[PDB]
Design a protein around this ligand. Structure first.
Ligand SMILES: [Cl-]
Ligand SMILES: [Cl-]
Ligand SMILES: [Cl-]
Ligand SMILES: [Cl-]
Ligand SMILES: [Cl-]
Ligand SMILES: [Cl-]
Ligand SMILES: [Cl-]
Ligand SMILES: [Cl-]
Ligand SMILES: [Cl-]
Ligand SMILES: [Cl-]
Ligand SMILES: [Cl-]
Ligand SMILES: [Cl-]
Ligand SMILES: [Cl-]
Ligand SMILES: [Cl-]
Ligand SMILES: [Cl-]
Ligand SMILES: [Cl-]
Ligand SMILES: [Cl-]
Ligand SMILES: [Cl-]
Ligand SMILES: [Cl-]
Ligand SMILES: [Cl-]
Ligand SMILES: [Cl-]
Ligand SMILES: [Cl-]
Ligand SMILES: [Cl-]
Ligand SMILES: [Cl-]
Lengths: 152, 152, 152, 152, 152, 152
């Protein structure tokens, strides 16, 4: 099963990053990345079973994605979620299973590792350009949130 | 004179990154980072002497900055510019002189290297938290642009 | 809180290294490092809450250590564990909290990144010689396991 | 059009490097690299339109090159020049267009970036060995000049 | 003639490493890597002409090797030796000629470089997996010895 | 004892670099760096005990240096040598002990790593400007030789 990993380094602590990009994401993103999202429907409290229907602006390469939270561990700073619907799946991705952990570093900062596993119909391969796009955009959002955390 | 450098790695080529984050920035940013800016007044063609008056949304930690372009070298992929006004200067920074160069990497990607020099009144020091904030936000914008370049 | 990090590079893949030095460690170490341990009592299945009582040979500089597993993430290749007892704590270390992540490299190999945080009574500092010793010994064991993985 | 770039790092400041390798080159090279050149005819003052006819010693792989200055910017530390004649062109290079900029670094040093563009007849490609040779020899001369600047 | 080199970095000084991995190896290894060897017959004093018959535990991928010392230089920290018998030679390696030097580093540590030259019958090539195995196992033993030196 | 290290990267292989900057240096330098030296008296064959009396042109910041070869290892690509006389020692340096190793890189190139140890009378410190000068000049000569190797 095709997979990919993304590592993002930060000088901000693991506890604080995790709070920004997982626990408090719904109130943080509108203050941190003011126009990134067109709208977000949140069904659930943020723990397992929570489903978010996200919509990006009209012209964007990806306009819609639906993301289900599979597991949260506040003590271990880990988050598991699956993309289950939207044009993000292109014509042929059944689901994008993701597993994230935020680990501390000796300098008091952190590394946020994410592993993505792409479940596709048959032998269909997700092209490298689409994976790079996702990495850029996820890093963009991460860093916008890092900026908000450093200032608040 | 207090100084700081920021390096950002990308899998996109040096020529392409430079076109996105310097040459075509005025048409790229509205498509790439749709809400990042509230408004931009551009006085000039993008070459030396060009002055941009930038305004961010109401709540933001930095609401206004005025940036002058000192030099552009399309062939060398370098860009020099100075922040000369705005609440970005806090109470006491006279100007933020910056020098950027995009250098290619063996893998066909690039490293964008920026040096910032802070000119202050007297012995006043710019605190580390404000520098980290700038780095986070500049990286966020860089990566939003990288995403747009990978897709177009 | 005093901290230290250790990075170990390997030409073996991230998935494979993680399986050797975390998932399958209890059957791998007796085949890979035949005399390294005098004995191991394992209480638990290898996941969170698992506690290992380890004893090294009679003369060794460290003769006993008790290590608790705090978290395992098989998908993210991260492992968190705490040293809670043994003469490894010298007279005065309350616990050694560790956080490990195995990250892949462009060449198909990996870097195993570990952060250790030393909790001590009062202002007591763990000397550099003891930290270097730990690094040497952990690397020795890592590489013995790497050898076993390359051959099997 | 085939192109190549060379980056050379130095601990010496950008202003000072530029003065050594561009502004004062004609008096610096005879003191810094005493035997490097056999002779230099300089037609012009060092600004745009200046043409230098350079001759290296009898046995050298490259014996002659003629270099025209296209542009100098003393404030921006940039220099543009074209190689227009000599056995450096081999049988088939029409001209070697070069663009150099010296950028400052946070540590008070500098990076000297040069982009070379090779204009050839038809689809003729300049081999990698010839480009590496040029890089070695230009770096050799740069560093000889760096040495002179550090001492004077 | 097929060859390979291995570089191992250490924070321990060159003199001290050399004493551990060459001069005092016969008394150090039993204290440092208690189970690594099953037995060692040493014929000679440790200088040129010395021959060691080494046997590893029953299951190991390599069970036997015979190593001849070709040259020792205590002042220069260099050691030359040849593997001349054992299942380490697989079916077809005539001998493994090795040359080691321990060089000091500015930080007071050292780099131990080893060059191995594989003499084989005909055009037979030693596979990359076997060379990686050797590197892992030699590094494992090196680091076990480093640990002993740091503690004694 | 005060020390310093210098690393020089090259795209040329380790074997070839070593042959140019150690083994064949006496015939290579007159072809590669035609005017660098005024004269060289060589006493010995190039191996241990060899002593070179070197004289640079009249004006140069360093006019004379006497260098003894302490050790050569052709197989390991290491070279040890000591500067024992000349105005290079300024008023007060007793000797400059150097240790060089050329190590190969994954890309088929090399890194030449040199450690210099300055033995001085009393607590006398060698200033940073003199060390930087030496680095510039040694790099200049290295790269002139690299150029000759790429062409021959
Ligand atoms: Cl895959
Ligand atoms: Cl990957
Ligand atoms: Cl923090
Ligand atoms: Cl599947
Ligand atoms: Cl500073
Ligand atoms: Cl900095
Ligand atoms: Cl591209
Ligand atoms: Cl100033
Ligand atoms: Cl600390
Ligand atoms: Cl550390
Ligand atoms: Cl593998
Ligand atoms: Cl604490
Ligand atoms: Cl090209
Ligand atoms: Cl290039
Ligand atoms: Cl300077
Ligand atoms: Cl053309
Ligand atoms: Cl080979
Ligand atoms: Cl090799
Ligand atoms: Cl030591
Ligand atoms: Cl042979
Ligand atoms: Cl020092
Ligand atoms: Cl140093
Ligand atoms: Cl080569
Ligand atoms: Cl001394």
């Amino acid at each position: 099963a095709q997979s990919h990993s993304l590592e993002i380094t930060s000088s901000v602590s693991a506890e604080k990053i995790f709070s920004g990009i997982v626990l408090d994401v719904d109130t943080v993103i509108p203050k941190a990345a003011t126009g990134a999202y067109k709208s977000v429907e949140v069904k659930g409290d943020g723990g397992a079973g929570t489903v978010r229907i996200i919509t990006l602006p009209e012209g964007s390469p990806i306009t819609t994605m639906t993301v289900r939270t599979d597991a949260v561990n506040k003590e271990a700073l880990s988050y598991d979620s699956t993309v289950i619907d939207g044009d993000i799946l292109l014509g042929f991705i059944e689901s994008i299973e993701t597993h994230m952990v935020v680990v501390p570093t000796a300098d008091g900062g952190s590394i946020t590792k994410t592993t993505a596993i792409f479940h596709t119909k048959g032998d269909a391969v997700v092209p490298e350009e689409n994976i790079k796009f996702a990495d850029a955009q996820n890093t963009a959002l991460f860093k916008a949130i890092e900026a908000y955390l450093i200032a608040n």
